[PDB]
Amino acid sequence: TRHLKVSNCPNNSYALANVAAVSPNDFPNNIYIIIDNLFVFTTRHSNDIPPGTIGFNGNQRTWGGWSLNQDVQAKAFDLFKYSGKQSYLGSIDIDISFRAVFDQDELAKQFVRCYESQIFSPTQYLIMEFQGHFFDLKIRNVQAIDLGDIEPTSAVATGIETKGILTKQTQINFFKGR
Numbered sequence: 001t002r003h004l005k006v007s008n009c010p011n012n013s014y015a016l017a018n019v020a021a022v023s024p025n026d027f028p029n030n031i032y033i034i035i036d037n038l039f040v041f042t043t044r045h046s047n048d049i050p051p052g053t054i055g056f057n058g059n060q061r062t063w064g065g066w067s068l069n070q071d072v073q074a075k076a077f078d079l080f081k082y083s084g085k086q087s088y089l090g091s092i093d094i095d096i097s098f099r100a101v102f103d104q105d106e107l108a109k110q111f112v113r114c115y116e117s118q119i120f121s122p123t124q125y126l127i128m129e130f131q132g133h134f135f136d137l138k139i140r141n142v143q144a145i146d147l148g149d150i151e152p153t154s155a156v157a158t159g160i161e162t163k164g165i166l167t168k169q170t171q172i173n174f175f176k177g178r
């Protein structure tokens with residue numbers, strides 16, 4: 001369990017990849033970590049981030065309710081341990097809007113391309129680039145499933161407690177924001 005200070009990470013290599021920028025000596029690269037017992041992100045090493053700090057873009061900070069320099073608690077995250085079999089995303093509904101032509105199929109491809117294997121949960125706020133434009137994505141709801149079942153046993157979830165891994169078979173539903 002690490003204690004890290006939140007810093008802004010606007011560089012597009014990170015800001016568009018929806019990752020938690022960490023120092024190589026705080027966490028290994030590309031693993032799941034959970035912040036403040038609620039927010040799960042995939043890690044990404046950065047040599048330009050002070051050991052003891054963790055970088056997030058504006059949307060991720062808004063989601064966690066973290067202000068700059070705010071101390072935060074981070075721990076390696078084990079999805080199985082957390083939710084057992086109901087660990088994969090069967091579907092995910094996203095509220096999408098232009099950052100401060102609507103193609104559902106293309107937006108979905110880009111989403112899987114950029115975030116496959118990442119964990120998502122309702123309420124999660126992230127930034128995604130699509131054909132030269134930046135968009136704010138808010139995960140509205142999720143449908144967690146056990147890949148072993150021919151159909152979901154659980155209902156569509158709206159709470160941040162339900163977390164699931166994005167796969168190439170996850171149905172992605174976008175909603176032209178407001």
Ligand SMILES: *[C@H]1CC(=O)N(CC)C1=O
Nearest residue numbers: 009010011021046048055
């Ligand atoms: C966050 C992580 C990183 O290395 N950068 C570039 C300076 C960020 O924006």
Ligand SMILES: *[C@H]1CC(=O)N(CC)C1=O
Nearest residue numbers: 013016017113114115129
């Ligand atoms: C966002 C979109 C994408 O494909 N990447 C890298 C694989 C991003 O960072």
